[PDB]
Amino acid sequence: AEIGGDHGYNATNIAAGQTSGAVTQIGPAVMGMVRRAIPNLIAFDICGVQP
Amino acid sequence: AKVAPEPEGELPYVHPLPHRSSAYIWCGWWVMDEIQKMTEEGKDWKTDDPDSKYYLHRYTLQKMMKDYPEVDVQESRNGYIIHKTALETGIIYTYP
Amino acid sequence: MNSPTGQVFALRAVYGKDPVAAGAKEAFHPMYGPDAMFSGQGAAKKFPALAASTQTTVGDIYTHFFQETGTVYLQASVQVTIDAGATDAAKLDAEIKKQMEAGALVEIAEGMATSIAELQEGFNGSTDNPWNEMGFRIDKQVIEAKSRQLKAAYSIELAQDLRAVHGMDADAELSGILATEIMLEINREVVDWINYSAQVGKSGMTLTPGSKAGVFDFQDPIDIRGARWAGESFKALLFQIDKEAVEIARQTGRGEGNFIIASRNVVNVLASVDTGISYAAQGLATGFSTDTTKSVFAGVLGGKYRVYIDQYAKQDYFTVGYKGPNEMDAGIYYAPYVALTPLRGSDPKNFQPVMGFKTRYGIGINPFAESAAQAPASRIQSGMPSILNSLGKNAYFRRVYVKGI
Amino acid sequence: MNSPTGQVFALRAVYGKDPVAAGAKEAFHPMYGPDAMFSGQGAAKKFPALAASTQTTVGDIYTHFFQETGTVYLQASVQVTIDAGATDAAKLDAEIKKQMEAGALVEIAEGMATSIAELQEGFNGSTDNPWNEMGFRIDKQVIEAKSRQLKA
Amino acid sequence: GMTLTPGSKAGVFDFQDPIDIRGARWAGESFKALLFQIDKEAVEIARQTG
Amino acid sequence: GMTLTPGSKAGVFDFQDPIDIRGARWAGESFKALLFQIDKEAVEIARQTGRGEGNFIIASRNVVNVLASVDTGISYAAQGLATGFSTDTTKSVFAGVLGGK
Amino acid sequence: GMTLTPGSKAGVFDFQDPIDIRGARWAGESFKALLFQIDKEAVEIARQTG
């Protein structure tokens, strides 16, 4: 019975396409990349500059 | 009759007023309600309940009336300055 | 999802030549400030750490790392001892903060001398002075779909009797009921995660020092800041909401809290106070849909937060959360894959029909959710929520219980 | 009414395989929350009823039904006892509320694995994994027309 | 039940009880306290009927 | 120094101490007391530097939040959801212009 | 009768009795008590006369 099965919910087996069934997956799709936001400065309208 | 046990330091500031032998401190409505709660089951507010959640403002007031004969303590519900013998009873204006 | 098992990458910048090393510090961080002497003098000398009962010389610089607020370098203004009675890390932080406020230790950042700078990495026959390089990591989290299903199992006799007496189809209704409950149940799951993964509000930086560490009470004058009468007490709740949302902005590093989920009592309190900056007011509920029958979304609070009513709230609460304009900058992902697939059949032994439904959705967490971990483990992590990585850790939500309404 | 003694019918959406049974719950009850894991994990395993004297286990999940606000499933994050002194329902509900506020017992709801729900109710030679079911009950309420009169 | 502020008298609204009027003063605020109590009851009606 | 109130805490402005908040009741006025403290600090800057009143505030999130939740002008007692200032350290550190000054 | 607050003086509205003035403060709020009292008397005339 092509009980296709399902992953073990283990992160590696989800990524690897490893499933407990007869069909082995391609890959874990993709949803985009989350980067750490770059913090904003305070500039120097608070202190001198004098290059 | 008895002395209220001393609860460490950090006593709220009492302003000396030698102009009339009086003194001013802002207590708030919670104390003026709590002390109003105190004098309804026969209890005492000068020295009873040493482990109170609001004992500190109660202890300072007791010494303040001894130091000053006509203390001027102001609440916040109406902001009135009840005097020492006006503070004696614990019933301020109304209510059970 | 177009196929089960979605995945999402996450790029982190960390410094020290080693993107992947035990205890590398993430460079850009919503909470942790930069090692402001990492590129400067910290690339010339290594400063002794601050520890419990560490006697202080005057003029030396000591590093430290509060659990919040990141790295900091403190110069000593007066010789002191750190009171190793604060052996615990959180107590160490409390001691160091007390000393800093006392002015004994004050933070400083500096650059490196030119005579040291120009020789970096053995120019002019020096040695042992490498540069303070940086790098980036890139890991990924993966999210696999679960399923959810139900059955009806009625009989044809019931169908005939129902269509005859009441005219109800006796099949569609069942399917309706089935689908309804399933969808309803799915919704509940999501909400519970929001409450489940919520951080404890009213605590840490949002905690007024005189309050009860996580619960906002309308009887405590410390919480209502001495307000009398309802017209002024409720604006204290407004201020509490503001504190929680601001702290979310701090920990998340994406934005202020922009939605609020709260019970009927809290929402009705909100709808009956003049939300904007005003003197004091209280009356009938006008600005919000306080009944959970026309809709659950009750309104917009002051143009900032969308307010939703949890009609099944157990005691009383509000939870402030952030949901960015982008779909990824979310905190929690409800990612449907198959929607309410129906199935029909009958029992061959008695011809009596059976109705059923099944769906596969799954649900995942935003990476960076903990917001206090510079770098994850194993680089391929389980995006699905659990106790190890979501229970009171997801900084995107903060939950506070309200008593005394 | 164009006839005396009218009657009305009430349709109650009740889950639990037997619409007319003791202890059956109404599915869309306004006071009572949905059985959030009825169609999810609750169809794969049965969560222990959280009653007096229980010793909670970190990570484990319990079930309860409050007299108000309805059903709930509680994952325990700290090993606590539930104050066996509680006997009646109100006392137990209040104690569970105290524990929930304490953060040692947080509500939860989860979906069910595909590798399970694929085999539900005896597929592929499996056994002892019935689906969860729901039907409706429909009961009857009747009134009679009393009268009233006067003379001049 | 849900409509009780923990210190009240469970079914009677007393204009002399601070918990019932949320601590209001004079007639300007006490009446608004009555309005809020009415709002609370309507909310509970929405809750129980659905 | 001369910014002290005689009964204050000498270096920390405490919202719970009635001496510092000038006897204010409730929140819409205990906040105004903070604005008054800011003004006194700036005037002492003008005294000590000899160049004029201080014109900028570097403050943590909570201070800015309480600043943005009151009517900063001379306009009775008022309080509500913070709207006049940007408390997001995500959008910009620069909170805004308090009182136009 | 119906015009009586259970704490009042039964036929005299007293500006010194806190039950009568609804706990008002200064003359701004203490007179509005007499306003409300006149409203109650008008209502009772409506009830008795019909």
Residue numbers in the entry:
A (entry chain E): 66 to 116
B (entry chain Y): 281 to 376
C (entry chain F): 117 to 521
D (entry chain A): 117 to 268
E (entry chain A), G (entry chain B): 320 to 369
F (entry chain E): 320 to 420
Task: Please share excerpts from the published article on this structure.
However, fitting of the Hoc C-terminal domain (residues 281–376) from the AlphaFold model into the cryo-EM maps at the vertex-proximal gp23* capsomers of the isometric and prolate capsids showed only two preferred orientations for the bound Hoc molecules. These two preferred orientations, which gave major contributions to the observed cryo-EM density, are related by 180° rotation around the hexamer axis. The Hoc chains fitted into the density corresponding to the two preferred orientations showed significant overlap, indicating that only one chain can bind to the center of the gp23* hexamer. The 3.4 Å-resolution five-fold-symmetric reconstruction of the native prolate T4 capsid (EMDB-32109) also shows similar preferred orientations to the Hoc C-terminal domains attached to the vertex-proximal gp23* hexamers. Similar fitting and refinement procedures were performed for the Hoc C-terminal domain attached in the two preferred orientations to the gp23* hexamer adjacent to the “top” pentameric vertex of the prolate capsid located on the five-fold symmetry axis. The occupancy values for the two orientations of Hoc were 0.42 and 0.35, which are close to those in the isometric head. The Hoc C-terminal domain, in both the preferred orientations, interacts with six gp23* subunits with an interface area of ~1200 Å2. However, at the gp23* hexamers proximal to the capsid vertices, which deviate from the six-fold symmetry, Hoc binds in two preferred orientations, which are related by 180° rotation, in part because the other orientations involve clashes and, most likely, less stable interactions.
